């Protein structure tokens, strides 16, 4: 169908732009490279890994 594929695309692009802003803040030494960065990315990792690659 279409609804489900667009659900997935939008769910991904929100994360992607969020990650991208996060990458630039790491370029400008804005935020930190202590941590909570690391702990943020290990939250994105877990979000995605639950239904990784439904194969049809």
């Amino acid at each position: 169908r279409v609804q489900y594929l667009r659900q997935i695309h939008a769910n991904h692009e929100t994360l992607l732009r969020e990650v991208q802003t996060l990458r630039d803040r790491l370029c400008t030494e804005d935020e930190a490279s202590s941590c909570a960065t690391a702990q943020r990315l290990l939250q994105v990792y877990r979000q995605l890994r639950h239904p990784s690659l439904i194969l049809l």
């Binding site: 630039d24 370029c27 804005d30």
Partner: protein
């Protein structure tokens, strides 16, 4: 006493602060100190009297890895993070290309643009690119730009229109600038069916 009653003000007394508002303040302050920063000026300060030409040293080669190490050398001297140098230089070269002569630009402009964007992608891969600095440095231009250029940025995946249009100070200025550009466009896409393809693509986008 009516005098007094008319003076007696209200939002005058203020107290406690949220430590999130502290970072918000510091963030809007840092944002301000960089917005009224310019990099051209910085280069003219430390080094006495910027282009790919400047960094690469009078058309040495056009190799991506070469030019990367040049930006490392530059940033090492200036003590600025390599991202913003790269952003400013690329935006200066965008201004150059877009100025040398209405909406579209589809000969040789496209070719220069694509070779420059080919290097933007290398820069992003190696983490030598601030998107946000770049968006700021484009809104500093804001007139030279063509909607074709911005659509190439969008589709090549260097900015998203959402990240650009939400990083301009005056939202009304963006609105009016687009309004005029889109009016000129929908007047165009009648000049030829070839240019109409690209115009219709970016319009639908």
């Amino acid at each position: 006493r009516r005098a007094w009653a008319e003076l007696l003000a209200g939002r005058v007394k203020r107290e406690k602060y949220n430590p999130e508002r502290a970072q918000k303040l510091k963030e809007s302050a840092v944002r301000l100190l960089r917005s009224h920063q310019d990099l051209n000026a910085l280069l003219l300060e430390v080094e006495g009297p910027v282009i790919d030409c400047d960094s690469s040293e009078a058309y040495a080669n056009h190799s991506s890895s070469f030019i990367g190490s040049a930006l490392q050398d530059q940033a090492s001297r200036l003590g600025v993070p390599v991202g913003i140098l790269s952003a400013g230089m690329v935006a200066s070269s965008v201004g150059q290309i877009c100025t040398a002569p209405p909406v579209l630009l589809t000969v040789e402009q496209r070719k220069k643009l694509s070779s420059l964007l080919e290097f933007a992608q290398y820069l992003l891969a190696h983490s030598m690119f601030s998107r946000l600095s770049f968006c700021q440095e484009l809104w500093k231009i804001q007139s030279s730009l063509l909607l074709e250029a911005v659509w190439h940025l969008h589709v090549q995946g260097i900015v998203s229109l959402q990240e650009l249009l939400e990083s301009h100070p005056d939202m009304h200025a963006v609105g009016s600038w687009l309004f005029r550009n889109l009016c000129c466009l929908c007047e165009q896409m009648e000049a030829s069916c070839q240019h109409a393809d690209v115009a219709r693509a970016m319009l639908s986008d």
